Amino acid sequence: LIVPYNLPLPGGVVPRMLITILGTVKPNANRIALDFQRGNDVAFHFNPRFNENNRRVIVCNTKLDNNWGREERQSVFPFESGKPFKIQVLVEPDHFKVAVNDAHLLQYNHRVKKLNEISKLGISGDIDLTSASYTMI
Numbered sequence: 634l635i636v637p638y639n640l641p642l643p644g645g646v647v648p649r650m651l652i653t654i655l656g657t658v659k660p661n662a663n664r665i666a667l668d669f670q671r672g673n674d675v676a677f678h679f680n681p682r683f684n685e686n687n688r689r690v691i692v693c694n695t696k697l698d699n700n701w702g703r704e705e706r707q708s709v710f711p712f713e714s715g716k717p718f719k720i721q722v723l724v725e726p727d728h729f730k731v732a733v734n735d736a737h738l739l740q741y742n743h744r745v746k747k748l749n750e751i752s753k754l755g756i757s758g759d760i761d762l763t764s765a766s767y768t769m770i
């Protein structure tokens with residue numbers, strides 16, 4: 634799949650919806666980004682950064698009307714340059730739950746409440762995208 638890749642989510646997101654992304658981090662990778670979009674707004678921005686002040690950190694945020702909000706940062710960094718990964722985003726009623734390589738990583742409380750209007754997922758960054766899909770559990 635060509636990155637940046639756009640995965641349309643017909644009818645928006647809904648609890649019990651599971652998105653699975655498989656890929657390989659490029660060697661010398663700098664960043665990865667998943668953008669759950671509601672029109673121009675970004676409902677949930679998941680952004681692993683490989684070198685932020687020589688620190689590997691995951692930044693999560695929401696962008697409303699061209700403005701980024703309060704960042705939520707995670708130190709647990711499970712991605713590795715040059716290695717295959719699997720990211721699963723499970724949509725729950727109150728949060729997006731993220732697990733990487735089968736290990737729960739983080740939860741992101743819904744700032745954008747109209748879930749049915751979050752109808753696109755943008756995937757970009759320094760990765761080789763192998764697969765991107767969704768299902769209902």
Ligand SMILES: CC(=O)N[C@@H]1[C@@H](O)[C@H](O[C@@H]2O[C@H](CO)[C@H](O)[C@H](O)[C@H]2O)[C@@H](CO)O[C@H]1O
Pocket residue numbers: 678680692693694701702704
């Ligand atoms: C430490 C700190 O506050 N750093 C922020 C940067 O993280 C921020 O970068 C933007 O962050 C958003 C997510 O919040 C998104 O990843 C953008 O791509 C990225 O540019 C920057 C701009 O808001 O400000 C710094 O101070």
